[PDB]
Amino acid sequence: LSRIYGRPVSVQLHVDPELLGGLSITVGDEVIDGSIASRLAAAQTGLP
Amino acid sequence: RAQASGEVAQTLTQADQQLSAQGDQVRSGLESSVDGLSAKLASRILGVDV
Amino acid sequence: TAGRVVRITGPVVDVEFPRGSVPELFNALHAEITFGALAKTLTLEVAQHLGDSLVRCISMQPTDGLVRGVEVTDTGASISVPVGDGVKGHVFNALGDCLDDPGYGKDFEHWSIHRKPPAFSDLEPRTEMLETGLKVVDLLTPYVRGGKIALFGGAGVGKTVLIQEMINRIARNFGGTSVFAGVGERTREGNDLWVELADANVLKDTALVFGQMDEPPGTRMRVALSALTMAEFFRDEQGQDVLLFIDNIFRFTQAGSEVSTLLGRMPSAVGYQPTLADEMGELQERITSTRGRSITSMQAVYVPADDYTDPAPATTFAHLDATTELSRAVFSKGIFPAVDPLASSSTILDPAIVGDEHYRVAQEVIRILQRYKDLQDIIAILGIDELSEEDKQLVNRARRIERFLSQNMMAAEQFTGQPGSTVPLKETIEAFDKLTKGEFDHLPEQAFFLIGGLDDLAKKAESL
Amino acid sequence: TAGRVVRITGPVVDVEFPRGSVPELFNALHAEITFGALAKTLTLEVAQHLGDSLVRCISMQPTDGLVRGVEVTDTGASISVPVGDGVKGHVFNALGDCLDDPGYGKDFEHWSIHRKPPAFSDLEPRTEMLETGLKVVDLLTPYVRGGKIALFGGAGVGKTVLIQEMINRIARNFGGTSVFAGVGERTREGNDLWVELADANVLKDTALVFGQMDEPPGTRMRVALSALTMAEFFRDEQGQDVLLFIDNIFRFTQAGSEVSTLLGRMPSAVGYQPTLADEMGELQERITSTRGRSITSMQAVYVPADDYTDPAPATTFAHLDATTELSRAVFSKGIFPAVDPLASSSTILDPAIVGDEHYRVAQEVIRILQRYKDLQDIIAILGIDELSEEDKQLVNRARRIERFLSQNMMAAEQFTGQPGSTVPLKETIEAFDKLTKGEFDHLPEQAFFLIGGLDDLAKKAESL
Amino acid sequence: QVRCVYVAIGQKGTTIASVKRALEEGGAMEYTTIVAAPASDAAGFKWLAPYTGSAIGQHWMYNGKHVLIVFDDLSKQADAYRAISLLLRRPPGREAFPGDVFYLHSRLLERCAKLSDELGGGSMTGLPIIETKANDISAFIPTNVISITDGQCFLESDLFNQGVRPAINVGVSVSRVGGAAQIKAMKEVAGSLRLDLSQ
Amino acid sequence: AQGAQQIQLMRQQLIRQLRTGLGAEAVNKAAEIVRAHVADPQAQSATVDRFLSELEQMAPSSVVIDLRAASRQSLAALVEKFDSVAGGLDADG
Amino acid sequence: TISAADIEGAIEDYVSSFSADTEREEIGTVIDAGDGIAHVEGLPSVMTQELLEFPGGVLGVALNLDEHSVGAVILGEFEKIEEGQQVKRTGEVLSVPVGDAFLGRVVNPLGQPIDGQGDIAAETRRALELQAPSVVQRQSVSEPLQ
Numbered sequence A: 001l002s003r004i005y006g007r008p009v010s011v012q013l014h015v016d017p018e019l020l021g022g023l024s025i026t027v028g029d030e031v032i033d034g035s036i037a038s039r040l041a042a043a044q045t046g047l048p
Numbered sequence B: 001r002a003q004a005s006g007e008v009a010q011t012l013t014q015a016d017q018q019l020s021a022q023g024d025q026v027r028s029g030l031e032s033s034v035d036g037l038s039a040k041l042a043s044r045i046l047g048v049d050v
Numbered sequence C, D: 001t002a003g004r005v006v007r008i009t010g011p012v013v014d015v016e017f018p019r020g021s022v023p024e025l026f027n028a029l030h031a032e033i034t035f036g037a038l039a040k041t042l043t044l045e046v047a048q049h050l051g052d053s054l055v056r057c058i059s060m061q062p063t064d065g066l067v068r069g070v071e072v073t074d075t076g077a078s079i080s081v082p083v084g085d086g087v088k089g090h091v092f093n094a095l096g097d098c099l100d101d102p103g104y105g106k107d108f109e110h111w112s113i114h115r116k117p118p119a120f121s122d123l124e125p126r127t128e129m130l131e132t133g134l135k136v137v138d139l140l141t142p143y144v145r146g147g148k149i150a151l152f153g154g155a156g157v158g159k160t161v162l163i164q165e166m167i168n169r170i171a172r173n174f175g176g177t178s179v180f181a182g183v184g185e186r187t188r189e190g191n192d193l194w195v196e197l198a199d200a201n202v203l204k205d206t207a208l209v210f211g212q213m214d215e216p217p218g219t220r221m222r223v224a225l226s227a228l229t230m231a232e233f234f235r236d237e238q239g240q241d242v243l244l245f246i247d248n249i250f251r252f253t254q255a256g257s258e259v260s261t262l263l264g265r266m267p268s269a270v271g272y273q274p275t276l277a278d279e280m281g282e283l284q285e286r287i288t289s290t291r292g293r294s295i296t297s298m299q300a301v302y303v304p305a306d307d308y309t310d311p312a313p314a315t316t317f318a319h320l321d322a323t324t325e326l327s328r329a330v331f332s333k334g335i336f337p338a339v340d341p342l343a344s345s346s347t348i349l350d351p352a353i354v355g356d357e358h359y360r361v362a363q364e365v366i367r368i369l370q371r372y373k374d375l376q377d378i379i380a381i382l383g384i385d386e387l388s389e390e391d392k393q394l395v396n397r398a399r400r401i402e403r404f405l406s407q408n409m410m411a412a413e414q415f416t417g418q419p420g421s422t423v424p425l426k427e428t429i430e431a432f433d434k435l436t437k438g439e440f441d442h443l444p445e446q447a448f449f450l451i452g453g454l455d456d457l458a459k460k461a462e463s464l
Numbered sequence E: 001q002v003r004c005v006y007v008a009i010g011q012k013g014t015t016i017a018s019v020k021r022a023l024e025e026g027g028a029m030e031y032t033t034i035v036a037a038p039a040s041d042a043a044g045f046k047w048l049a050p051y052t053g054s055a056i057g058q059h060w061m062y063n064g065k066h067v068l069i070v071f072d073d074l075s076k077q078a079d080a081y082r083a084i085s086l087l088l089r090r091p092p093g094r095e096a097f098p099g100d101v102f103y104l105h106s107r108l109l110e111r112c113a114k115l116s117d118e119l120g121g122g123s124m125t126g127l128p129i130i131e132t133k134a135n136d137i138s139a140f141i142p143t144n145v146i147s148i149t150d151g152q153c154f155l156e157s158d159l160f161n162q163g164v165r166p167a168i169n170v171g172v173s174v175s176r177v178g179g180a181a182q183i184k185a186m187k188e189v190a191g192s193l194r195l196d197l198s199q
Numbered sequence F: 001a002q003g004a005q006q007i008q009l010m011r012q013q014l015i016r017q018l019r020t021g022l023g024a025e026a027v028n029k030a031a032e033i034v035r036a037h038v039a040d041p042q043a044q045s046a047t048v049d050r051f052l053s054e055l056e057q058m059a060p061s062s063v064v065i066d067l068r069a070a071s072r073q074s075l076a077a078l079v080e081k082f083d084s085v086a087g088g089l090d091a092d093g
Numbered sequence G: 001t002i003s004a005a006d007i008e009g010a011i012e013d014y015v016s017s018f019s020a021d022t023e024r025e026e027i028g029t030v031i032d033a034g035d036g037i038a039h040v041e042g043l044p045s046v047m048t049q050e051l052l053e054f055p056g057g058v059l060g061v062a063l064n065l066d067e068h069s070v071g072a073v074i075l076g077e078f079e080k081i082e083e084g085q086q087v088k089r090t091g092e093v094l095s096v097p098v099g100d101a102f103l104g105r106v107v108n109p110l111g112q113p114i115d116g117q118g119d120i121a122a123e124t125r126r127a128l129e130l131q132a133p134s135v136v137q138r139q140s141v142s143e144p145l146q
Ligand SMILES: Nc1ncnc2c1ncn2[C@@H]1O[C@H](COP(=O)(O)OP(=O)(O)OP(=O)(O)O)[C@@H](O)[C@H]1O
Pocket: C154, C155, C156, C157, C158, C159, C160, C161, C336, C337, C409, C411, C412, C415, C416
């Protein structure tokens, strides 16, 4: 996080049992997510 | 024209069982490699080999 | 999951909810009134979100006696009504509770009243012509099976008489399951219809449910949907052709305007809803005949203040195929079937579907009536003295024919005390051709009042 | 220093500036828009101050593809357009960019669009008898050099053909410079006009500018101002007679009404923007001939639904002295000029400076037409047989006069194969005197329609 | 070769089905298409359909192919736009219509034109349809639409009942383009017939 | 030719059945394989490592700016005055 | 038959081609909604008349821009929207696909067939709003239309 953003970044962690794994980060308006549920939903929604 | 419509309906009532005849073997052979498709899907969804 | 009421005004009520859970749109909520004399529960319906975990809602019952802080519970589901084969033969209320035998039901299937119109590939055009004993109907605008029928008119011009006459004809000549509904009716008409149906020994196969004048507008907006829901249940599962009757659809639209004024939405032209086209379109398209399911409907529509420019019938014009109209002037003339021939229109009428003789006779009758209407302005002041004989002949012919369009239906049995009559279409067309030929011009005018057939015409004429 | 954008909706944009940075009213402002497919340079002009360095304005281009946070820069000046002698024979937009050559016209000196009205101390009325070849204008409403003459009528009356014929007939016999400006008109008409002027050698002698309807209303506020700026630059400096021709003036009034509605100003009763008469007076005064310079202005005014109770045509008339209007009933009769003689009037028709021969010509024709309008409906309904001998002869005379007034125009060549014709003034006076004294009552009805001259009348009489 | 595109707005699906059936019986479906926006849908589709049809036409327009465009109705679009604007808390106008509506119509009707020979021989024509009540023209919507068109035809029910099946009123109908479009033989054979009928 | 059109229509119906079956098997087998096979405790750590590597390899991005104008200026001036005035602040002061 | 085998092979090719990737984009929240309209908070990189997505698969268009709110209209189904959703900008002005395969078929305004069968081979997509040709690019009209 310090590499991508020059400013120091604090951490506030929230436990999410709904997700099957991965990790999600939000530094404000932007967001990054790697989630099994999200990826499988994306895979199935584009099957046809 | 009514005769032609009737013969067209006869061809339709032949095709309406022809597709079922083909679909019987279609559904018989659909699951030939379904496990392989699932394995490829898992490999892609996880990013590594299964 | 406990709600609290914060602000109330009129039939519209606000509610607040915990941040964790907020109900989704179109969900029923239960309340209570703690007053002794006015003890009653209320069913509320979600309308819209206003942020801060606030929800606006509409009451299904009169809202008097409510106090703030009353707990509100949610069932997490839309409004549902009972469906089953044994439903017919009973009268129902807006909420679905049986009226004649309280507590009846609650064990049949239960379905929601909000759905989606059928897809595009399942629809199909229909052209089956449907006949009736009336002559003015099948002469100008024949009715088509599986389409829509419209009876436009003003106030107190005998729409209900025509409706009950048609239902009598259809019940007597044909069977099949039937559903009747209605909004904006008087209880006396309800009692009269119930008694008549009990006498007819056909009320067992007719589903009945209707609101009245003195109800909150929410019921006046939901009863039509409930009736349409049960009709759709009969059409889909049973695979049977269904008869449907609805009455005074206009009131429905009116109700919406009222509630809009309470929500705070911006008003539109002539003080109507900001949006009205979409609801009318979705309600109209919900009635649709499938290939394996033919459904015939007939709706009576009101016209306010005897003006045709208002948007209420203007939008309805676009959703209709067979339409008949009434006028005040024709009723004032004296003939009771006050149907305007120059204004009525239909879409089934075409030489490819109808015989050439019918088309030609109809065109000639329309031309004669239009010419008489055109000369009505000039004849109004001078009269017939200045007018030439070449037009006097057509004047006499037009007067005779427009008097011949009258008829004595059975529906007047309790007013004039005389039996009605029915006429086959072939006799009607041959008689009208004879009359247009001018053979009957020597006969007196007053012989053509309230007559059934040409044989009765001749008998009455010779009787004087 | 620069500001930012805070609110975006429709064309109206409001921006924010720091301390000591607010510009005065009516300054050009540049905004930059970036996109893969839509790259432009928004030009805006200041409209009003909202306080706290928040200023609201409109835009000269559609606001598609905009994003908040984009800086806005100020040039510290009002709108300016290049002028000069090389401007002749070129096409320009509202901003002044040369359409024919994108890079042309970027070196001439520039003048501010806004100006000041001329002093009242240098005003003198202009009197002169300028004559054309057409009978109706020659006899009914003679034109005056240096004054204002306007056209009136509803939709599709044929005034564009009239203005085209007028410019074709006059520009050939003229040594001065002409400037044409189109506030609102279809692209096809402008392209056809450009092609037609290219077909002749007079195109080099004139200047062209116009704006289309597809542009936002902001561009429809300044085209007339740009034309007036060019006209005043030519007139004040060159000291030569100039021609300023305006297609319409209703369009910019419309666009002002809509922009004012968007600005949040309270509308008036009819819906027009308030202080519209102020804008009318500000615009109309710019066209003025001083003691040393002469300028002629041609304009046609569109009326909505041919309703003369609308305050806009009434307030636009007050700036006019010699006027000619058009009617739809006479067009429906079959006459192409379609000029109503009863209501059309001038300000130079009098025995003081013109012979009284014309005076009693006009009085005879006008009284004849007035009594003919009085007896029209009587001859229509009662019948010609009941009229008196004097009335019958007068009605025949009025029919002769009404039929004789029509005349072909060369601009109708593309519509009708018959070529047009031109007739001088004295012969028309003699012919009308002959007609109105009652010697040509023996000619047939068709012999007086679409007649070139008296000899043409004789030839067509010999043709029947 | 002429390619035509038909656009329908806010009509019962049965009407579109009947039109498609009649056209299929005609057998032209090898070179046509239909854009459907049934009245049961939301306001967005009704508001947007003509633009989609116009873009589809423009794509073939730039290629040099002649294209024909027909709009089923236009008042429905104005109604949908008015409803949207009133929902979005915008200020109203003359009988509750937004002011800028006229501009919209211009942006829809200015696209049709004929390209110069440099870019090809493509052409494009449109036949917008307007519905009126009690043959009234005083309502400003027909007035606004009229002023941005090159010619119009008036139809009345009285002539329909009289016996004239086309029921077009020659007294008011007019075309500004004139006879330059029609063939020279037509111009030689027929001339000033509208006048003669008028007298 | 229209009959051939309906022939292609029934081919499309077969395609629809194919899509439904493929979707059913795909969702079922994917859900079971992700809730049964990869549910091993070490898989969480492996996924975290891969996610960290992915976030490492991505190109750097630019970030800035971390309510009225007059209010903001007044707040800034007050903050500056506080900073210039709190020099002698004591533990109890 | 072998046609269904090839369809399954293409389905597997899609399976052997799916690769979802993380990307950088901004989000927003629905403050309120109703009657087919909705409001969005934040999301400062929006564009006038730009398309945006919704969690349920429906699409929205930004009409007006307030300094701290964005009003948008729902195109399709709107009864599956509640406060607290997530929105994503597409960073592209509304556009429609076009192709010659559209002949002889019926489509919704967006461009998805509703009554036809199969799909459409669209070579390009073009923006809905463009600029009309200028006077210099036009020419007179002479051909007849019978
Ligand atoms: N054929 C007829 N025979 C006898 N009376 C008739 C006939 N047609 C109409 N009427 C009279 O006209 C009136 C119609 O009354 P009715 O209650 O049916 O009116 P409506 O128009 O259906 O009602 P609403 O006020 O709800 O529109 C009654 O007075 C009835 O007697």
